[PDB]
User: Fold MYB proto-oncogene protein from Mus musculus.
Amino acid sequence: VKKTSWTEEEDRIIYQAHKRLGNRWAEIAKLLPGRTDNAIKNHWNSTMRRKV
Assistant:
């Protein structure tokens, strides 16, 4: 399932924030603790793509 990757629970935060701010990883990354723009950006634009 998972071991060294983005957790579904963490994704909850990215989704909630992204739904309001959009692709504003600049802020979502700052709001998150040990996360970065690049990390969230590439993660979302790969995993969180075919959401629907």
